[PDB]
Amino acid sequence: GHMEQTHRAIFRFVPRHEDELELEVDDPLLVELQAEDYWYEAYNMRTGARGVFPAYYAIEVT
Amino acid sequence: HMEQTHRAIFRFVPRHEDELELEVDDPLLVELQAEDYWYEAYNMRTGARGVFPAYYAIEVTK
């Protein structure tokens, strides 16, 4: 499927919680949902995993 | 020396019970800089304790 990258990780995020998505710096992300509590629900296009992470760990591609 | 070590730079709304809520500019006393890039802190504004993603705070050169 076409997966349009929306965001890029800028900080390493190591989950402590089951629902979280692990991030490495520069990971390309497809952010599915920017939730009102400043968590993003995303697909990590490097790892193929899905989960949530703190919004400010990723920035928009454009 | 119950003195400020960090300042929050991003809003963090917990999804998980161990987490510390942050508002931008919150002064923090970070007790543990964990190896997994989570910090355990006292929020010197709210009086709450908990963990947050390390890059949501900056050191204060105090």
Residue numbers in the entry:
A (entry chain BBB): 487 to 548
B (entry chain AAA): 488 to 549
What does the primary publication say about this deposited structure?
The SH3 domain of JIP1 undergoes exchange between two distinct conformations, as evidenced by 15N NMR relaxation measured at multiple temperatures (Supplementary Discussion). The 15N and 1HN relaxation dispersion data were analysed simultaneously according to a two-site exchange model in which a highly populated major state interconverts with a low-populated minor state (Supplementary Discussion). The analysis of the data gives a population of the minor state of pminor = 2.8 ± 0.1% and an exchange rate constant of kEX = 2,600 ± 70 s−1. Aromatic 1H–13C heteronuclear single quantum coherence (HSQC) spectra show averaging of the NMR signals of the tyrosine ε1/ε2 nuclei of Y526, which shows that full 180° ring flipping occurs. During the structural transition between the major and the minor state, a void volume is created around the ring of Y526 that corresponds to a pocket expansion of 65 Å3; this is mainly due to the structural reorganization of the side chain of Q520. Notably, the transition from the eclipsed, major conformation to the staggered, minor conformation is associated with a structural change from a rare, classic β-bulge to a common, canonical β-strand conformation. Breathing motions along the structural trajectory between the major and the minor state generate the necessary void volume for fast ring flipping of Y526 to take place.
